[PDB]
Design a protein around this ligand. Structure first.
Ligand SMILES: *[C@@H]1O[C@H](CO[C@@H]2O[C@@H](C)[C@@H](O)[C@@H](O)[C@@H]2O)[C@@H](O[C@@H]2O[C@H](CO)[C@@H](O)[C@H](O)[C@H]2NC(C)=O)[C@H](O)[C@H]1NC(C)=O
Ligand SMILES: *[C@@H]1O[C@H](CO)[C@@H](O[C@@H]2O[C@H](CO)[C@@H](O)[C@H](O)[C@H]2NC(C)=O)[C@H](O)[C@H]1NC(C)=O
Ligand SMILES: *[C@@H]1O[C@H](CO)[C@@H](O[C@@H]2O[C@H](CO)[C@@H](O)[C@H](O)[C@H]2NC(C)=O)[C@H](O)[C@H]1NC(C)=O
Ligand SMILES: *[C@@H]1O[C@H](CO)[C@@H](O[C@@H]2O[C@H](CO)[C@@H](O)[C@H](O)[C@H]2NC(C)=O)[C@H](O)[C@H]1NC(C)=O
Ligand SMILES: *[C@@H]1O[C@H](CO)[C@@H](O[C@@H]2O[C@H](CO)[C@@H](O)[C@H](O)[C@H]2NC(C)=O)[C@H](O)[C@H]1NC(C)=O
Ligand SMILES: *[C@@H]1O[C@H](CO)[C@@H](O)[C@H](O)[C@H]1NC(C)=O
Ligand SMILES: *[C@@H]1O[C@H](CO)[C@@H](O)[C@H](O)[C@H]1NC(C)=O
Ligand SMILES: *[C@@H]1O[C@H](CO)[C@@H](O)[C@H](O)[C@H]1NC(C)=O
Ligand SMILES: *[C@@H]1O[C@H](CO)[C@@H](O)[C@H](O)[C@H]1NC(C)=O
Ligand SMILES: *[C@@H]1O[C@H](CO)[C@@H](O)[C@H](O)[C@H]1NC(C)=O
Lengths: 118, 398, 318, 49
């Protein structure tokens, strides 16, 4: 039910790694589940911070993590390094910069600005 | 050991594993005997060779005690005719000691003799002499038509004909008040009677085997005593195999044995030096043969489970916490577990090949380089397809 | 159990009688050995879920969260935590040994089990769920806690804005667990009680006559000749073999109960320690954040950390 | 089950014979009591959530 008829969020229940899907094969007196899983690979170290302070607002990632490549700050998804510029559309504001341990300073882009400028 | 695995597995191939084969057991270096040191020969003569017997209503219990017996004289001389021994063998009777012996003596008809056994009824059993259900003893009887009859009749041998209720076991009742009838009647014995109506003398030796120090014993002679060594023993009949050790257990002067939860005897008082000895058993354990697959090698190693390497009767010997391991070499390296021995030790066939034993690695060791501002993010993936096999059914049987 | 040493002991005479029943001692030994191998399987599948033995860093900068009571104690060679030492004290032979009964050591030692729990806890606090899926990818602890919060549907700003409170609450709760265990372990205790009680019964059944003139077999062999002895010994054999079959059957049913509990604990290890659970009440009351495994005698303690809502207010809604 | 009332009933004679088998009636009653306590535990853990 939970691996073939569905995708499982249950860790290690349908193999090691994140479950994608499973296939049943019959065997004598039993069943073989072929479990297909996404296993992450070729990781890299990045400097990280919980929030960006911009104009005194604390920005947080909507669906990702803040990382830096040594010079610039990016937002990326946790399980595959796809770096995107930090914008008002992939971050959300909450409060002033002083309450968060470890906030870092970078600009947060607003796409409405260069559109209004053009 | 490999042949023993083949034969216990009932197979000519043996697969890689550790197999319990057989149990080790250390063996008795000698057979001790310790007995009472009593010289007085038991006075059974004055029952079997008394001139005139009692009447069976008034059966007489001679106590025999603090004496040395020899029942092979009473048996193998075979002037007797019946010799039924209940709860004790007529032969092992010479090898045993008894707390007391009671000799119960009377004369009866050769027919009515068949009533004197445990769990019986009839004239003699009901009113004259009753043997208890758990009686230990020998009914010994012989023809006495040479002494206990005469022409014109003997009338010496009274029996109780009536009682208000049957006897209890070993009950004596010599009362004579009228029951109307006088409650006793007598055998008229004449020589010319047939085999069943002639008189027979009976002596019943009621043995007892209480927790008291045994005061009657057979003729066997005590040996010397040896200690911190495995022996067979007999101690007033207490028989077993053990490593007799000088006990510090503080027996009170009346006590003769000490006991285990199983009612094995844990310690014993020596019947002559009166010291207390522990009887911990001579050591034992399972034997497990570590084997690679027989398609790999016939070379094998053997684990004596719990046995200490000082005890086992050899080019490599190693003391695991699971037991002594012979024929595998301990290597200070660590590997994945191949055959599990126990307590952190595993064994494998490795280089020139031989069985190594080793402490298993739980895994390679890693320091994750955690830091308050460092994250690792995967830049790629692999797609993994793994097999999980589960039983679902088994063969339907009727 | 050496079935022959239990039923007959040293006597060859009894051993020859016992052989006429055939396979029953082999069946008994084989069943008890299968139970024994299953206990190493149970421990392996519960604790050995980690591929590598992870070590914690020297600088325990986990954002105010203080794991000192549950991480390994540096002052001891045993490498157990403070709570694991409390657990071992809060649960922890001759008569059995001499009558043919033997107790075998576990394959993994208590130090090896504590080394697996150390690895699981170090992996968790340094890398979150990632060490279950694949490599132990480091992430700062407050950020993995912020993604625990996001998992329970609480936006991660709630974590960072209240971080020092959340750390104080966590540290305090671990302190209460320490005091509770110092005051607790009924399920583990019951299993030890049942197995000791079953063995004490199996030993005491050696005293029973079963209708024979005595229960002490060397009485009979010192006292009756062969053909009369054989009846008595066949009574003892019958009742002792029925005592052994009763013991081994109850051990097969207890073995199934512990096997089920070990399977459950292996699931809880995967789904609560190597991951965050969306399954209600599977990893404690409240919304699950994370769990920490601690070794216990013959078993495992999960310290489940959960978010429990508090100080609610009424509002009009649409 | 009263193992003695089942096997023997009112008979003292049978009861004395039965004692020679020892612990078996205690084992039986203990097992059935453990089964009985488990049924309250089953109900507790299902409904008393
Ligand atoms: C990721 O980095 C670690 C080292 O930590 C980083 O550098 C520190 C100085 C500090 O800035 C931290 O915040 C960083 O996270 C690497 O670990 C070391 O690797 C070397 C080999 O290159 C090895 O010899 C050391 O033993 C490692 N350090 C420890 C403590 O064991 C790690 O290799 C990097 N991983 C990746 C995937 O890049
Ligand atoms: C971090 O990433 C940025 C890209 O997002 C890098 O910036 C670019 O650098 C190249 C030269 O290497 C220039 O041609 C581009 O114009 C730069 N783009 C921007 C937006 O600045 C930056 O070099 C990277 N830093 C490191 C240390 O690798
Ligand atoms: C991060 O950015 C803020 C501004 O957005 C910095 O705050 C200013 O710091 C200076 C002193 O360096 C003060 O004179 C200003 O009054 C501060 N501004 C505000 C709005 O508070 C902050 O110092 C920066 N921090 C770092 C580490 O770069
Ligand atoms: C194996 O047996 C020997 C005895 O044959 C044990 O040696 C004794 O050990 C104790 C300490 O435990 C000492 O006090 C004794 O003096 C030792 N006796 C001798 C003769 O050396 C040994 O400890 C046993 N080892 C194991 C692992 O069981
Ligand atoms: C973690 O918690 C423990 C208490 O559980 C703290 O231990 C104290 O440490 C100081 C030295 O730093 C000692 O003087 C105290 O006696 C310790 N107290 C106890 C009860 O042992 C420890 O400091 C805490 N560490 C962090 C980083 O929070
Ligand atoms: C990381 O730790 C250092 C001390 O080792 C501290 O000075 C620094 O502020 C910390 N950074 C964050 C983001 O908490
Ligand atoms: C009875 O006495 C005779 C000698 O008169 C002797 O031969 C016999 O052995 C004695 N029997 C017993 C049982 O003492
Ligand atoms: C029995 O033998 C011991 C020596 O082993 C001796 O001291 C003792 O005096 C003997 N018994 C009697 C009653 O003399
Ligand atoms: C025996 O071992 C050889 C390798 O040395 C292998 O080729 C062969 O298949 C094995 N046979 C069995 C029955 O395992
Ligand atoms: C193993 O290590 C010990 C020291 O801990 C050493 O004395 C011994 O000789 C070593 N044995 C082997 C086979 O290397």
């Amino acid at each position: 039910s939970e691996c073939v008829l569905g995708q499982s969020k249950r860790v290690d229940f349908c193999g090691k790694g994140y479950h994608l899907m499973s296939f049943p094969q019959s065997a004598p007196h039993g069943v073989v589940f072929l479990h297909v899983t996404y296993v992450p690979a070729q990781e890299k170290n990045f400097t990280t911070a919980p929030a960006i302070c911009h104009d005194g607002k604390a920005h947080f990632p909507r669906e990702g993590v803040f990382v830096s490549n040594g010079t610039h700050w990016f937002v990326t998804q946790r399980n595959f390094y796809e770096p995107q510029i930090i914008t008002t559309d992939n971050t959300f504001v909450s409060g002033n910069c002083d309450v968060v341990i470890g906030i870092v300073n970078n600009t947060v882009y607003d796409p409405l600005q260069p559109e209004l400028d053009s | 050991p490999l042949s023993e695995t083949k034969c216990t597995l009932k197979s000519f191939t043996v697969e890689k594993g550790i197999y319990q084969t057989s149990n080790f057991r250390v063996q008795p270096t000698e057979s001790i005997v310790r007995f009472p040191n009593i010289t007085n020969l038991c006075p059974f003569g004055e029952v079997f060779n008394a001139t005139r017997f009692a009447s069976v209503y008034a059966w007489n219990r001679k106590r025999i005690s603090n004496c040395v017996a020899d029942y092979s004289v009473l048996y193998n001389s075979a002037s007797f005719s019946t010799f039924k021994c209940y709860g004790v063998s007529p032969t092992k009777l010479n090898d045993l000691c008894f707390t007391n012996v009671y000799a119960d003596s009377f004369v009866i008809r050769g027919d009515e003799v068949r009533q004197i056994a445990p769990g019986q009824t009839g004239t003699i059993a009901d009113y004259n002499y009753k043997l208890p259900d758990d009686f230990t003893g020998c009914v010994i009887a012989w023809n006495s038509n040479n002494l206990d009859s005469k022409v014109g009749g003997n009338y010496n041998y009274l029996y109780r004909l009536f009682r208000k209720s049957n006897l209890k076991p070993f009950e004596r009742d010599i009362s004579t008040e009228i029951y109307c009838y006088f409650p006793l009647q007598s055998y008229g014995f004449q020589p010319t009677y047939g085999v069943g109506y002639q008189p027979y003398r009976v002596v019943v030796l009621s043995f007892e085997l209480l927790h008291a120090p045994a005061t009657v014993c057979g003729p066997k002679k005590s040996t010397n005593l040896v200690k911190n060594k495995c022996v067979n023993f007999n101690f007033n009949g207490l028989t077993g195999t053990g490593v007799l050790t000088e006990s510090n257990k503080k027996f009170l002067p009346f006590q003769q044995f000490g006991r285990d939860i199983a009612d094995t005897t844990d310690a014993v008082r020596d019947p002559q030096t009166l010291e207390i000895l522990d009887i911990t058993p001579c050591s034992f354990g399972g034997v497990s043969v570590i084997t690679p697959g027989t398609n790999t090698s016939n070379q094998v190693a053997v684990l004596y489970q719990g046995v200490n390497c000082t005890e086992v009767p050899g080019s490599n010997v190693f003391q695991t916490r699971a037991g002594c391991l012979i024929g595998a070499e301990y290597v200070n390296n660590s590997y994945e577990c191949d055959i599990p021995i126990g307590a952190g030790i595993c064994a494998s066939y490795q280089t020139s090949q031989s069985i190594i034993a080793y402490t298993m690695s739980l895994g390679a060791e890693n320091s994750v380089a955690y830091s308050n501002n460092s994250i690792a993010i995967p830049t790629n993936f692999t797609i993994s397809v793994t097999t999980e096999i589960l039983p679902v059914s088994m063969t339907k049987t009727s | 159990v050496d079935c022959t040493m239990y039923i007959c002991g040293d006597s060859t005479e009894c051993s020859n009688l016992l052989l006429q029943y055939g396979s029953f001692c082999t069946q008994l030994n084989r069943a008890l050995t299968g139970i024994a191998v299953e206990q190493d399987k149970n421990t392996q599948e519960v604790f050995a879920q980690v591929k590598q033995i992870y070590k914690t860093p020297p600088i325990k900068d986990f954002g105010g969260f203080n794991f000192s009571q549950i991480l390994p104690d540096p002052s001891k060679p045993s490498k157990r935590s403070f709570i694991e030492d409390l657990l071992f004290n809060k649960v922890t032979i001759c008569a059995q040994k001499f009558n043919g009964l033997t107790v075998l050591p576990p394959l993994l030692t208590d130090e090896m089990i504590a080394q697996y729990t150390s690895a699981l806890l170090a992996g968790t606090i340094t890398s979150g769920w990632t060490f279950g899926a694949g490599a132990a990818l480091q992430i700062p602890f407050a950020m993995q806690m912020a993604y625990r919060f996001n998992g329970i549907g609480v936006t991660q700003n709630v974590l960072y804005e209240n971080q020092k409170l959340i750390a104080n609450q966590f540290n305090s709760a671990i302190g209460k667990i320490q005091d509770s265990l110092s005051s607790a372990l009924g399920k583990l205790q019951d299993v030890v009680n049942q197995n000791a009680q079953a063995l004490n019964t199996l030993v005491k059944q050696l005293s029973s006559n079963f209708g024979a003139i005595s229960s002490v077999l060397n009485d009979i062999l010192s006292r009756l000749d062969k053909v009369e002895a054989e009846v008595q010994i066949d009574r003892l054999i019958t009742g002792r073999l029925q005592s052994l079959q009763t013991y081994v059957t109850q051990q097969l049913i207890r073995a199934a109960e512990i096997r089920a509990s070990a399977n459950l604990a292996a699931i809880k290890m995967s789904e609560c320690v190597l991951g965050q659970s969306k399954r209600v009440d599977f990893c404690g009351k409240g919304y699950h954040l994370m769990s920490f495994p601690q070794s216990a005698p013959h078993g495992v303690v999960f310290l489940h950390v959960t978010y429990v809502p508090a100080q609610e207010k009424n509002f009009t809604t649409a």
